[PDB]
Design an enzyme around this catalytic site. Structure first.
Site, PDB file in Angstrom:
ATOM      1  N   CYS B 108       4.642  33.106 -20.553  1.00 31.48           N
ATOM      2  CA  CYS B 108       4.036  31.971 -21.264  1.00 31.48           C
ATOM      3  C   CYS B 108       3.130  32.353 -22.413  1.00 31.48           C
ATOM      4  O   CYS B 108       2.044  32.927 -22.219  1.00 31.48           O
ATOM      5  CB  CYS B 108       3.288  31.001 -20.304  1.00 31.48           C
ATOM      6  SG  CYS B 108       2.625  29.582 -21.220  1.00 31.48           S
ATOM      7  N   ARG B 111      -0.797  30.418 -22.985  1.00 30.10           N
ATOM      8  CA  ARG B 111      -1.814  30.527 -21.937  1.00 30.10           C
ATOM      9  C   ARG B 111      -3.278  30.446 -22.366  1.00 30.10           C
ATOM     10  O   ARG B 111      -4.126  30.317 -21.518  1.00 30.10           O
ATOM     11  CB  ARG B 111      -1.589  31.786 -21.085  1.00 30.10           C
ATOM     12  CG  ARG B 111      -0.423  31.620 -20.106  1.00 30.10           C
ATOM     13  CD  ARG B 111      -0.238  32.926 -19.365  1.00 30.10           C
ATOM     14  NE  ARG B 111       0.384  33.972 -20.189  1.00 30.10           N
ATOM     15  CZ  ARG B 111       0.449  35.245 -19.840  1.00 30.10           C
ATOM     16  NH1 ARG B 111      -0.134  35.670 -18.713  1.00 30.10           N
ATOM     17  NH2 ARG B 111       1.098  36.097 -20.625  1.00 30.10           N
ATOM     18  N   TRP B 280       3.120  21.248 -24.479  1.00 30.65           N
ATOM     19  CA  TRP B 280       3.690  20.718 -25.725  1.00 30.65           C
ATOM     20  C   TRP B 280       4.566  21.807 -26.307  1.00 30.65           C
ATOM     21  O   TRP B 280       4.438  22.955 -25.902  1.00 30.65           O
ATOM     22  CB  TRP B 280       2.626  20.306 -26.753  1.00 30.65           C
ATOM     23  CG  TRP B 280       1.544  21.303 -27.032  1.00 30.65           C
ATOM     24  CD1 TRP B 280       1.601  22.388 -27.885  1.00 30.65           C
ATOM     25  CD2 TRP B 280       0.241  21.294 -26.476  1.00 30.65           C
ATOM     26  NE1 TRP B 280       0.379  23.040 -27.892  1.00 30.65           N
ATOM     27  CE2 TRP B 280      -0.464  22.388 -27.028  1.00 30.65           C
ATOM     28  CE3 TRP B 280      -0.415  20.453 -25.547  1.00 30.65           C
ATOM     29  CZ2 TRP B 280      -1.804  22.673 -26.687  1.00 30.65           C
ATOM     30  CZ3 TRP B 280      -1.755  20.735 -25.215  1.00 30.65           C
ATOM     31  CH2 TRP B 280      -2.429  21.836 -25.790  1.00 30.65           C
ATOM     32  N   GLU B 285      11.330  26.570 -29.985  1.00 28.32           N
ATOM     33  CA  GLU B 285      12.073  26.191 -28.778  1.00 28.32           C
ATOM     34  C   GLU B 285      13.170  25.191 -29.169  1.00 28.32           C
ATOM     35  O   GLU B 285      14.316  25.297 -28.738  1.00 28.32           O
ATOM     36  CB  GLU B 285      11.147  25.577 -27.711  1.00 28.32           C
ATOM     37  CG  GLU B 285      10.027  26.509 -27.211  1.00 28.32           C
ATOM     38  CD  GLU B 285       9.099  25.834 -26.192  1.00 28.32           C
ATOM     39  OE1 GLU B 285       9.561  25.574 -25.066  1.00 28.32           O
ATOM     40  OE2 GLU B 285       7.919  25.557 -26.493  1.00 28.32           O
TER      41      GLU B 285
END
Ligand code: HEM
Ligand code: HEM
Ligand SMILES: C[C@@H]1CC(N)=N[C@H](C[C@@H]2CNC[C@@H]2OCCNCC(F)(F)c2ccccc2)C1
Ligand SMILES: C[C@@H]1CC(N)=N[C@H](C[C@@H]2CNC[C@@H]2OCCNCC(F)(F)c2ccccc2)C1
Ligand SMILES: C[C@H](O)[C@H](O)[C@H]1CNc2nc(N)[nH]c(=O)c2N1
Ligand SMILES: C[C@H](O)[C@H](O)[C@H]1CNc2nc(N)[nH]c(=O)c2N1
Ligand SMILES: [Zn+2]
Lengths: 409, 411
Positions: B108, B111, B280, B285
Site C-alpha cells: 500500500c 499508508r 481513494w 490505477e
C-alpha cells in the site's frame, strides 16, 4: 520443489525446475525479502567441486556426459589443481562459460541474444598497454560502424589475488563529472569520484559536459595506468527530436556502445576480474535513466519548459509528457544515424519469448523483475505481468568493489 | 540485528529493526526470491500466543504495558479462549487492529493516511440483508459527495470456518463483463466469471459497457444473496480531456470509490473474512491498469488512433504517448468533478515521507517495491530509487480464495 510462474495477462503458467541447481545465496530469507536491494582466493578444496560442477554441465551440453573425454578432462583438471592450486580453461570451455554467464544474468532483458556472443580471449595479456590494445579492438569490433555486435574480452584470471587485472572504469565509455566552484555539477554527476582519480593520476581534463573518460587499466596487480581511447573509435550520437526543432539546441549527445567493465566473471570457480562486455542500448537506459534521473543529467525541467507545459502542478503530468518526448528523441536519433538500439516494447516482447524458450528447453530462466521491468511505462510492457523467479546460477557475472578502495599503491 | 536500506537518488540510509517483530514467512528463501509472485480454523494452543502478542502490542501503544488493566485483559481473554475456543475484541482493540493492518500492508502506497480510518463495527450483523445495509452506509459515508473518507466495515469473525461471512465481490463497486459468442468482451473482462455467477443467481444484466455489479453477500455460511446498490449512492466520473475534445466521445467513465471487499483481516489470531475497506484512487490505477491493460478495457489503440500517432512501429512510443494523455484525462476529470484522487507523483512523494517517519518512530516500514512503484513513469518517482524491505507484520490483510471455489451450497 517444483515452482510455478504465472503470466497474469495471458494466464500462461510455466514450471521452474532449474532453480534446484542454484548455488549462490539471494540475500532473502523466509522472514525478509531483499528483492529491491541493489547489493544484497579459493583453496584447492573449494576449487575442485566448482570445476567439476562446471565441467559436468559443459560435457552435458555437448552430449558427451560420462564419456571417456569427460572423465579424462575431469582427471586432468584435478591433477592441475592439486599441483598448481588452479587450472586453465580450454578455449571451448571459456566460450561456453562466458555465454552461460550472460544466459544466467537475471537482471538482463537482452538474453535472447545470449548464444551470439563474440568472445575475445585476452588471457595472454601481460601489461596495461596490452590491455589497452585489446580494448580498442573490442570497441571497434563491437561498434562495427553502428551495426553493433555483442562481445566480451577476457583478461587473465585471478591467481593469489595480489596480481588482479582490473579495468578501473565502470564502463569502457562514460562521460566525466566535475565539481564546480558554483556548487553545481558539470557533466555526469555519477562519475565525479572517478574523474578526480583520473586527474590525480595525471589526466588533463577538458572540463566539458561530455568528455569521454580515459581508461585506467591495471595489469598483474600493478598500479593502474591511463590510456585514452582513440576518439575516432568512440561512436556518439547527437540527440534531436523528429517534431521539436528546438530539441537539438539542448546540445545533448550519448555514446553508441554500452560496455560494462567492472564486473567479475566466474567460470568453474575461476575468477576473471577484468572481462569488459558490450551489447547495444535499450532506449530507456539513456532517455529515462541517464538523462532524467535527478542525480544524473537531470534534464526534465529544461525539456518541460521548452514544451511550455504547466509545471505548476504535478497532476498535469508534465514530467511524464516530457519523459516520453526525451525517449522519442533518443530512439529517433540512434535510428537516424543507423546505430543499433532497441525500444523497451520490442526488448521486453523478446524477453518473454526468450523466457518461454528457456522454460521449454532448460526448465527455467532466473529473472529479477525489479530490473527487467523498464523504468517507464512498466505495465504496458508484457514483463510487468510476468511472474519471475530470481536465483543465482554459475557461470555468473558478479559485482565487485571499486578497486581504489582495494588497491595498495 | 540491524538491516540497512539505501536511497540511490539521495544517498539517505535508513536502519530497520522492526523486521525482528516479523514471524510469518515471505515465500523467499536464501536460494530463491519470490518477490514478483502475486500469491507466494485455529486451535486453542495456537490462539493464545497470538492473542497475547496482539494485546501486548495494543497495551504498549496506549502506554499501559504491564498495568493491572493489561494483565486483567490477558487473563480475561485466556479464560474466554479456554472456555469458548475463541474470544471477542474490545471496540478499542478492533479499531487499533484495523488501523494497524493498514499500517502493515506492504503493498500500500497510501499508508501516510493509516491513522485516519473510520471503523464501522458490524460484528452484530447476522443476515445478508443486514450486510447489505451496512455496506450501503459505508459507501455513502466514504463517498461523502466526492470528498472521500477512508473506511472499513468489519463483519463477524470466523468461528468453525463453516459459518463465514463473505462479500463475493472483489470490490464493492465494479463493472460487469460479458463474453460474447464471437469471443469479444463487452465491459470489464476482469469480471466475466463473477458476472456469470450473478446472472446465474438471478441478476437481470443490462448488458452494457459500464454496468455496476450487484453485491453478492454471504452471511453465517449461508448461500449468498444478491442486492443492487442504490444507483444514487454510486458516484461516477465521466472521463474527458482538458485539450482533446474528442476524448469524451470514447464514452469512458469510472466510479469514484475504490473499495476492496475480498481480503481477510487478521487481528490477534482472529479472522475477519468479510472486511470491506475503501480509500481513494491513485490515478494510474484507472488510467494505466483498468483502461490500458490488454486484459482490461484495453483502450490504447483507439486513443492513439484519435491522436493520429505513428502506429507502424513501437519505437515511435505511440503507446507511451497515448498512456500519458489518458492518465491526464483521468486526473482532470476527477479534479473537475471534485472527487478525491491523487496523482502518482504526489502519492509516491508522500509515501517516502511516511516511510522515513516510520523508520524513525517505529524502526521500519515493510514495503513491496514491485507493487509500490507505479505502473507508468517508474523511475521519475522517488520510490523507484528507494530500497525497501518486505516482511509480514500482524495485524494484517491477507488474500483469500474466491468463495465460489470453496462454498458448500446449501440449496
Ligand atoms: C545485446 C544487447 C543487450 C541488451 C539490449 C541488454 C539489456 C540490458 C539492460 C537494459 C540491462 C539493465 C541495465 C541497467 O539498468 O543498468 C542489462 C543488464 C545486464 N546485462 Fe544485458 N543486454 C545486452 C547484452 C548483454 C551482454 C552481451 C552481456 C554479457 C555478455 C549482458 C549482461 C548483463 C548483466 C550482467 C546485467 C546486470 C548489470 C548490472 O548488474 O549492472 N548483457 N541488460
Ligand atoms: C487513502 C487512500 C489510499 C490510496 C491512494 C491507496 C493506494 C493503494 C494502491 C495504488 C494500491 C495498489 C492497488 C492495486 O494495484 O491493486 C494499494 C494496495 C493496498 N492497500 Fe491502499 N491505498 C489507500 C487506502 C487504503 C485503505 C483504507 C486500506 C485498508 C484499510 C488499504 C490497504 C491496502 C491493501 C491491503 C493493499 C494490497 C491489496 C492487494 O493485495 O490486492 N489502503 N493501495
Ligand atoms: C550499485 C550497482 C550494482 C550493480 N550490480 N550495477 C550497477 C550499475 C548501474 C545499474 N543501472 C545503471 C548502472 O549501470 C551502468 C551500466 N548500464 C548497463 C549498460 F548500459 F552498460 C548496458 C546496456 C545494455 C547492454 C549491456 C550493458 C551499480
Ligand atoms: C491475485 C491478486 C492477489 C492480490 N493480493 N490482489 C489482487 C487484486 C488485484 C491487484 N491489482 C489489481 C487488482 O486489484 C484491484 C483493486 N485495487 C485496489 C483498489 F483500487 F480497490 C483500492 C485502491 C486504493 C484504496 C482502496 C482500494 C489479486
Ligand atoms: C532500489 C532499486 O532496487 C533500484 O533503484 C533499481 C530498481 N530497478 C532497476 N532496474 C534497472 N534495470 N537498473 C537499475 O539501475 C535499477 N535500479
Ligand atoms: C507479476 C507481477 O508481480 C504482477 O504483475 C504485479 C506487478 N506489480 C503490481 N503492482 C500493483 N500496485 N498492482 C498490481 O496488480 C501489480 N501486479
Ligand atoms: Zn525475495
Amino acid at each position: 520443489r517444483f515452482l510455478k510462474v504465472k503470466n497474469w495477462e495471458t494466464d500462461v503458467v510455466l514450471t521452474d525446475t532449474l532453480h534446484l541447481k542454484s548455488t549462490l545465496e539471494t540475500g532473502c530469507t523466509e522472514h525478509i525479502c531483499m528483492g529491491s536491494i541493489m547489493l544484497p582466493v579459493r583453496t584447492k578444496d573449494q576449487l575442485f567441486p566448482l570445476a567439476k560442477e562446471f565441467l559436468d554441465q559443459y560435457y552435458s551440453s555437448i552430449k558427451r556426459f560420462g564419456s571417456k573425454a569427460h572423465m579424462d578432462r575431469l582427471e586432468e583438471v584435478n591433477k592441475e589443481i592439486e599441483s598448481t592450486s588452479t587450472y586453465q580453461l580450454k578455449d571451448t570451455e571459456l566460450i561456453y562459460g562466458a555465454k552461460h554467464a550472460w544466459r544466467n544474468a537475471s537482471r538482463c532483458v537482452g538474453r535472447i541474444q545470449w548464444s551470439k556472443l563474440q568472445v575475445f580471449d585476452a588471457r595472454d595479456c601481460t601489461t596495461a598497454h596490452g590491455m589497452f590494445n585489446y580494448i580498442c579492438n573490442h570497441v571497434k569490433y563491437a561498434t562495427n560502424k553502428g551495426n553493433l555486435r555483442s562481445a566480451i574480452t577476457i583478461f587473465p584470471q585471478r591467481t593469489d589475488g595480489k596480481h588482479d587485472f582490473r579495468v578501473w572504469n565502470s564502463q569502457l565509455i562514460r562521460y566525466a563529472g566535475y565539481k564546480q566552484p558554483d556548487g553545481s555539477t558539470l557533466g555526469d554527476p555519477a562519475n565525479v569520484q572517478f574523474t578526480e582519480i583520473c586527474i590525480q593520476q595525471g589526466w588533463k581534463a577538458p572540463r566539458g559536459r561530455f568528455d569521454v573518460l580515459p581508461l585506467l587499466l591495471q595489469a598483474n596487480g600493478n598500479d593502474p595506468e591511463l590510456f585514452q581511447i582513440p576518439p575516432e573509435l568512440v561512436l556518439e550520437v547527437p540527440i534531436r527530436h523528429p517534431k521539436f526543432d528546438w530539441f537539438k539546441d539542448l546540445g545533448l549527445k550519448w555514446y553508441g556502445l554500452p560496455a560494462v567493465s567492472n564486473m567479475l566473471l566466474e567460470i568453474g570457480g575461476l575468477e576473471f576480474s577484468a572481462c569488459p562486455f558490450s551489447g547495444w542500448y535499450m532506449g530507456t537506459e539513456i532517455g529515462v535513466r541517464d538523462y532524467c534521473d535527478n542525480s544524473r543529467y537531470n534534464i526534465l525541467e529544461e525539456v518541460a519548459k521548452k514544451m511550455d507545459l504547466d509545471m505548476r502542478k504535478t497532476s498535469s503530468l508534465w514530467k511524464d509528457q516530457a519523459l516520453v518526448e526525451i525517449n522519442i528523441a533518443v530512439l529517433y536519433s540512434f535510428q537516424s544515424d543507423k546505430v543499433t538500439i532497441v525500444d523497451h516494447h520490442s526488448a521486453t516482447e523478446s524477453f518473454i519469448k526468450h523466457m518461454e524458450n528457456e522454460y521449454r528447453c532448460r526448465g527455467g530462466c532466473p529473472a529479477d523483475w525489479v530490473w527487467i521491468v523498464p523504468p517507464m511505462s512498466g505495465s504496458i510492457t508484457p514483463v510487468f505481468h510476468q511472474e519471475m523467479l530470481n536465483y543465482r546460477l554459475t557461470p555468473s557475472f558478479e559485482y565487485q568493489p571499486d578497486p581504489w578502495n582495494t588497491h595498495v599503491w
